[model samples]
Target: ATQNNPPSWGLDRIDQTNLPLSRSYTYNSTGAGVNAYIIDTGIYTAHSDFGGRATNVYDALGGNGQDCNGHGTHVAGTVGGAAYGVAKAVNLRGVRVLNCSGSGTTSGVIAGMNWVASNHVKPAVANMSLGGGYSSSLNTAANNLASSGVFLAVAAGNETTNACNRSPASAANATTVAASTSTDARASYSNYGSCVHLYAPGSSITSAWLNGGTNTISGTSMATPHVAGTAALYKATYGDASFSTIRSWLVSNATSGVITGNVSGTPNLLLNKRSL
Candidate 1:
């Protein structure tokens, strides 16, 4: 895999070698204060990491809301994993749209998005790390929610190319993310384009697996969680901040000179660190 330097954006200076969360205070305590919607495959409610934090797990496919596959679980852990979730203190509400095989129609994704938006229990953040070819209908629904002040995060896809071809990711409203290697270079599997807002640590990363030992995974799936958790952190700190303000904080704070591979011959912002 090729290593690249991250752009001159506000990137967190934390030690990646150390665990995301501290031993003294569990993220559960902070999670109890905020809510994040994990719109993906079903979650393993029985998993210890979720323990008692899972509030609502709804199936968008069969309309039963159960995770038959583990893709959703893996994604959920990325957003709010007990060990590595960026915002461990934020509670997670699982919206199961994809079945056990980790596949779903655009309608299912839209349905889940609507459910999350319409529900009275509004989450501060929503993590959608799944995407297909291209769908205006799907992007419309996602953008609607984002315009309504919901913090929507989506994956930029796994196609390593010059064009950003992922739906919802290519959408201008939501925060678009690219994958980064351990050395801060863009992952070979990550899609690229000027549409990308920032890059995060997404290579050979370890997070919640079947049990809890930590399964090493990569791609935008892992990178998206870093932004998701960062959103949780902002929401926790500022109760009434708008979505635009939060988004600004994330990009402006991203560290500079980290990622490489310029698409438009310029560097993209990394993390938004401005305080609201």
Candidate 2:
């Protein structure tokens, strides 16, 4: 509704400088009417922070899309929690692909993506914070989902190695995100190399968790949603634009040469959405 003085460090760092991280998180659009599918474990849609904006769309592990593990809910919070989210007004849809252990097979994930491709609302974006060794099956599913017109923001993983080996992240149409700390350093565990597109604050991120609480966590998982959330902001404005249009706008406008501890082949772009 208005400019936010966000409570989380990740939200604060995104819209301001690394030198003097402000409490302000500014945006012209709150991604209203935009759909953001959380393709992760599951989302606790009952979490108060979601304000009834989050819903269970599909669950690959069975039952409703309730988050037994906190990963997906955390990702949902970053995407559209009223207080903790980047797109404060997005319609958050949960597509559960992982189990309670925060793990799942490639088949389950592909199934989840297919569901989204068939049912996703217009002006949509999806976040995939989970990743693993390359699978042609998984990669093709990602390609199809992107082809269906939803913008994809996928994690580069936390292996501290080349991200090209990771699924979805290596998918050409999906935007890959790497982890950056509060101090603007590349998070030590973040996967890098040619697949990475944008860096966002990932370490020590405090956001919604299961049981109607909050938790702090780290990894490229945390970074991916920031980009997804920002993409939602873009979609909110240009509802008919294609994924490449949105991706190019974000990539071209990102604050360049900001991330430290550079790795070869990785872009130096950092996510900056203050003007969006």
Candidate 3:
């Protein structure tokens, strides 16, 4: 079958950030050579949007690596699906931490992180769209991965409170992302505060779903992959830069504005993918 262009609104919103697509270049990078590990429930590998790229599935909970909760599938689509993804060419992987119920212990998530840290064949980016209360073990695992050259992007919780109160989101080595609406305002459900590194469109996000279908969802979970995909794009484009350098590039290029609620430490900046 022939490929259709991504939906106008979704494409426009993605292009607005200047990522995967950019003004300086005529062709979209699509994060072509970068690997993005979606550490969540799991991913439905048969999704056509993935273009046969999703591979290396690992289950931390000792179950088959498959997305029953839909969260992991949606997050994976946003990272690399042909229609909903930001880095359309990104190599995708599922490190299943959460089970079919979308719930998991911190140890489960830490185990997934450790696996990625030890087993990846190339420099990769990891996206954690799930989080809960703080855990020192999880924080250490995240920091270790970052120190090992893995670019980690985590979701600030939807609780609308301090993101620092969350585990991987508060991990110093991870880029904690808050959710923004189409208007570039903070999503009402997004957690904020100093720990959040940036914001992206997360509300009512349309993406690939289970069984080769599609769905719309909202949360910092949706916002995170936007940054994760961007990070993968940069990793592919600037293969030599350190993860810290890429993080600085992103933070420096972010667009600033007054966000809703005006919470402290919540940087009033919208993610701008073009500056890279």
lDDT, candidates in the order shown: 0.66, 0.89, 0.81
What are the RMSD figures for all models against the true structure?
Answer: 6.1, 1.2, 3.4
Among these predictions, the greatest lDDT belongs to 2
Worst 10 residues of 2 by lDDT: 1-10
lDDT for each residue of candidate 1 in 116-160, tens digit (9 for 90 to 100): 777725447888888887778888898887776678888777887
Off by over 4 Å in 2: 1-4
Write model 2 residue lDDT over 57-144, tens digit each, in one string: 9998776888899999999999899888999999999999998889999999999999999999988999999999998888889988
- Give the clashing pairs for model 2: none
TM-score of each: 0.83, 0.97, 0.92
**lDDT value, candidate 3, whole model:** 0.81
lDDT pick, better of 1 and 2: 2
Candidate order, TM-score descending: 2, 3, 1
Q: 2 or 3, which is superior by TM-score? A: 2
In terms of TM-score, which candidate is strongest?
2
Q: What tens digits encode model 3's per-residue C-alpha lDDT throughout 92-164?
A: 9999999888999988888899898988657589999999888888888999987777888999999988999
* Window of ten residues with lowest summed lDDT in model 1: 1-10
